[model samples]
Target: EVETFAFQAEIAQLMSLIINTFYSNKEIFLRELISNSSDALDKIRYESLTDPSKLDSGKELHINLIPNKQDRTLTIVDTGIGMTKADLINNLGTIAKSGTKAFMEALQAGADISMIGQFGVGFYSAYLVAEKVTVITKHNDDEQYAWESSAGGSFTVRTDTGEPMGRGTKVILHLKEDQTEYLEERRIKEIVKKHSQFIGYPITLFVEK
Candidate 1:
């Protein structure tokens, strides 16, 4: 069965602010996503030290960035710990961490916010460049599932029947008409080098020259 959720009132307001205020620095979205992917990889690796049966056991950790200019889509895939159905709700629906809640409170208080710290609200930054975003993930504890939204306050989660990702998550951004530059190989590579070069995983970009 599919499940749908509405962002809490604070989170809804936070999304609106992120979309409107951060459009100028949209490239940071890739940095935020890659950071989240690295964190997921770290989580699984740590778990595997004591439990060898953790997700993606023995798989080389890496991140893949695939740009499809024809389709105007950019996909980020990672060999890391993926989300369960409930995880989709908690992490995406509510503020995943208190930092975001504090950020939201500060924004409401008219504080000068410089940068977003991490994933909780940073993931919403994707909507600044993409009209729609889709996340397909598989975790050892749950069946593979896909979560999708247009940054419209609500999102749906359903079982994914596509080829399994083994274990990890894939985020596909359907670029807006004006955001097609993200599909360029050089542009993507530059962004990765600038923001994610020091990330603890190999980030491979796939594009046609």
Candidate 2:
């Protein structure tokens, strides 16, 4: 079922603070995203024991980074429980009501809040480097959908036009000029190891020279 939900005004203000004030290091975006993808893999692992069929898409869980220097785009693909249209809008468009407001309040209350302890908001980290973000996801139980946004106020969700993959998610980031630092192979690898080395899954890099 398709539905639309608006972010509470406080949420927009909270995101603005995160996008504008927090995270001096732009590279943290990669860490946050990879960490999130790792969590997805972990979730699927737990679900597989109960239902062996969960392994149909792929037994192994890994994060693949495909950086296209030609298009200046970086796509992070994962074989995990993908999101439906509702999942896209709810997960990507709006932040979690309680956690987000609390996190922001903590920061305002002088609690050196660095990043979100929650997950949904992590997608917004894309705005740090992306002029535009497009998420293509196909859930094991739902139809494929595409969610696109500029991180301003609203996002658009439409049925995906391309052939749906078995069950997974792919996040394509159109890198902003200032965010080209993420397009380099060595840099991407080093950052991944530094922040996401402990992630439960293997993180691979696919960068074209």
Candidate 3:
């Protein structure tokens, strides 16, 4: 069954603030997303150490950047630990609950702003560039699902009827009118090289010359 949920009060407020006031540079959204993918891959790789079967039968850990100029869409795909339905709700919906409060407190306390991603709101940064975001994911223990939001107060999750991803997640960003530069292969490659070259997994860009 498909499920829908409203963001917690604090989360909705934060999302509004983030889209309107928090970030000035929209390009950093790609960096934040790649960092998240790296973290997810790192986590799953670490878990595979304790139980080899947790590795998705040795699936390669990699990230793929696919750009669709026709649709003005940019997709970042990662072969990492995908989320279950509950994981989607708690991870993306609740503002990390207590974590949101702490983050706000730290921001007011003049915490080093460079560490904002550590606060768990980095995913929301995507809203700065994309009008809509779609996440399609599959986990070993759960069926494939799709989660979507417009950075509004609510989001929807439903069974994915498209081609299966096997495992891991794909985040597709519908570029805002002003943010179409992100769909250019050269631009995306530059951003990846500048901010994410050191990421542990391989990052590939699907582009045509």
What is residue 177's positional error in candidate 3, in angstroms? Answer: 0.7
> Is 1 or 3 the stronger prediction by lDDT?
3
lDDT of 3: 0.82
lDDT of 1 by residue, 1-209 (tens): 77888877766776777767744667888988888899899988898889877844347789999988778899999989888988887755554556667777776677533366532566777877898999999988888999988876888899999997888999999999999989988899899988887998888888675
Every model's TM-score: 0.90, 0.87, 0.90
lDDT per residue for candidate 3 within 45-84, as digits (tens), equals 8888888888753479999999998888999999888889
RMSD (Å) per prediction: 2.3, 2.7, 2.2
Single out the weakest 10-residue window by summed lDDT for candidate 1: 111-120
Angstrom error of the Cα, residue 148, model 3: value is 0.5
Please report the TM-score between candidate 3 and the true structure.
0.90
User: Candidate 1 or 2, higher TM-score?
Assistant: 1
Arranged by lDDT, best first: 3, 1, 2
